[PDB]
Amino acid sequence: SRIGKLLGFEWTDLSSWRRLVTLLNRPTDPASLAVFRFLFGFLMVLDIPQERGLSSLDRKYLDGLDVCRFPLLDALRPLPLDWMYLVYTIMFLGALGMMLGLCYRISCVLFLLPYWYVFLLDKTSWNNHSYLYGLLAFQLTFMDANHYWSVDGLLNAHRRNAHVPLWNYAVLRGQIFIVYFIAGVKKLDADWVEGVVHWGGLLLDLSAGFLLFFDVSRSIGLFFVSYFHCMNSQLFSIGMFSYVMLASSPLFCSPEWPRKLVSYCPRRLQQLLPLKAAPQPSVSCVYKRSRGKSGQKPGLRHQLGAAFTLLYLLEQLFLPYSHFLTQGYNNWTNGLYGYSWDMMVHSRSHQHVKITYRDGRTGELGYLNPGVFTQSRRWKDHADMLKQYATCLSRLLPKYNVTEPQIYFDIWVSINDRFQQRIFDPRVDIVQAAWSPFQRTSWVQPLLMDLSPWRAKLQEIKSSLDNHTEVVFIADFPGLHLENFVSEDLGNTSIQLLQGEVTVELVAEQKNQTLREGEKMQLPAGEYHKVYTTSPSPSCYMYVYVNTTELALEQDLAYLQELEIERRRNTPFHERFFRFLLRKLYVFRRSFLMTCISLRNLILGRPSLEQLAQEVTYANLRPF
């Protein structure tokens, strides 16, 4: 039958629940699962010092510092520094136990728990791959993969070579197909709707997933996917996300490829590892008992092992489209980067920030430099992060001779490069403003992306644009006002008005000249620019200027005209690889000695400050 070979499960198998559980729980060779678990454990062991930030844990979770934090849950406070150098060692032990196999369930739990404790602790450190590693660890906890090529096999008589159910491979393949197919779909929806190499990746996503499943296509599919994933390294700073998929692909091959690979390619010894004759029947595998009397009755380890696949794959498919349920996290474009399998927005051009505060006792105004406390910049363009920042400042300022201060932000984003628009309302007090994950926020100003004839003049002017100038479009809301002191280098500055009316004011001659729909006004340099909007509709400006003195100074340069990358490129790959190995050894050893110091502390007594300083200096010491 065509269904018999293509789509290996027979069509009549999908007839009842009791047939489905039998279909999912059927014996299969565990050879591939062992290799995948080994490589995943190896990679998770390797990346912990570098990417998860064990080398730079002292500089981030210091003691005696005052820093605002951005946790997913506001009650999930971090542990002290010397009780946080230990959870990473617990995580490392769990990952090593994953890799080898010793106490596989315990090692899986010991790696799972701290990873999801330190992942839901900084919303500014969520990537697309960290979520994937967490999901893979969560899957591998429940699926037994020590049945072949494991140390735990040599200390037991039931895991040397056994039969795993099929739903392990089913869940792994389904999860990776979802990863390959959801990203491709999101690449389509985003690109041509909000509006080469772009189409190549999209077609690769969808075609690679689909063809990699269906039988004859594996060789070409493996070639193409492997080429793409190997080339994506040294082109994106994604980390080890490429290597996880380069090792997640040979799980779409027949589940016996290691056994067929060892056979040929002759050798002198193939008997040190257990000789591959045949697996052994397992306990958790529904077998075809004699139909004369009755069939096997599956237990809880089969029915639950079948229902978990469905209840997990459906939820995984539903989650990346759960945007409409979490609305408070939704800024203009990207709400809670992470569980989306799509790329972020590159912070547009955030520019000017004007945090100001008023004291609740003396009623005095004060200015704060942007980002005085925090360690990240992502708190700026987010409604869920700005509230946390304001609340942290409200908590901490009363220790600086203030009391219940009221804070106002003025964030002038640039959506692409020429649409300066107030993303956050100046007039609202962020500390006492209501906020909820589901209910829509009230102080985020609605987008005015086009909302104007700004996409016509945009071109109608470039034909008439002279030499070295600059034109900026600014959209303003009703009931607010603006200010921008102009320098002493921009000449012929002028404003053209598109929607509504403006009340341009100069503080020097004290002029309050209003404008109607269409009026050219020449404004001087080095003066105030108090522009007010009185119309109920948002306005639009045509701020145009030319550096008239730039032509004068560039003529002087033209008058005179009439009057270690190379070293690193010439050098071959040997010394570059040597430098890579040296820096990796340095970071690994720094992590190891710092962890050893923190482990000695709070286990024994803490020694004197002199020894602490000496050993800290010793750890910093760069080798050669």
Ligand SMILES: CC(C)CCC[C@@H](C)[C@H]1CC[C@H]2[C@@H]3CC=C4C[C@@H](OC(=O)CCC(=O)O)CC[C@]4(C)[C@H]3CC[C@]12C
């Ligand atoms: C005499 C006193 C000062 C002892 C100090 C010795 C340190 C310099 C040693 C102790 C622990 C060593 C580390 C122990 C374990 C590893 C794991 C090892 O991991 C691998 O990546 C090797 C396997 C692979 O290539 O995948 C790399 C070397 C490293 C960082 C070692 C580097 C050198 C360290 C820090």
Ligand SMILES: *[C@@H]1O[C@H](CO)[C@@H](O[C@@H]2O[C@H](CO)[C@@H](O)[C@H](O)[C@H]2NC(C)=O)[C@H](O)[C@H]1NC(C)=O
């Ligand atoms: C120029 O005219 C504008 C009116 O558009 C004045 O703006 C007003 O300023 C007062 C100050 O207390 C506010 O109460 C009003 O609400 C503002 N009106 C608007 C429409 O925003 C501005 O003060 C004038 N300039 C000077 C120097 O007096």
Ligand SMILES: CC(C)CCC[C@@H](C)[C@H]1CC[C@H]2[C@@H]3CC=C4C[C@@H](O)CC[C@]4(C)[C@H]3CC[C@]12C
């Ligand atoms: C040590 C403390 C913080 C306990 C941490 C354990 C809890 C918070 C962690 C452990 C494993 C985690 C789960 C791992 C995988 C998934 C699947 C994903 O699609 C939704 C979130 C969800 C369901 C996680 C929710 C949080 C979770 C349950």
Ligand SMILES: *[C@@H]1O[C@H](CO)[C@@H](O)[C@H](O)[C@H]1NC(C)=O
């Ligand atoms: C104030 O903040 C700015 C931007 O975050 C920073 O560059 C500057 O160093 C801060 N001021 C001081 C005194 O550090």
Ligand SMILES: *[C@@H]1O[C@H](CO)[C@@H](O)[C@H](O)[C@H]1NC(C)=O
């Ligand atoms: C200023 O320069 C612009 C350049 O496009 C020109 O159109 C305008 O006439 C100039 N104005 C004055 C007053 O020189």
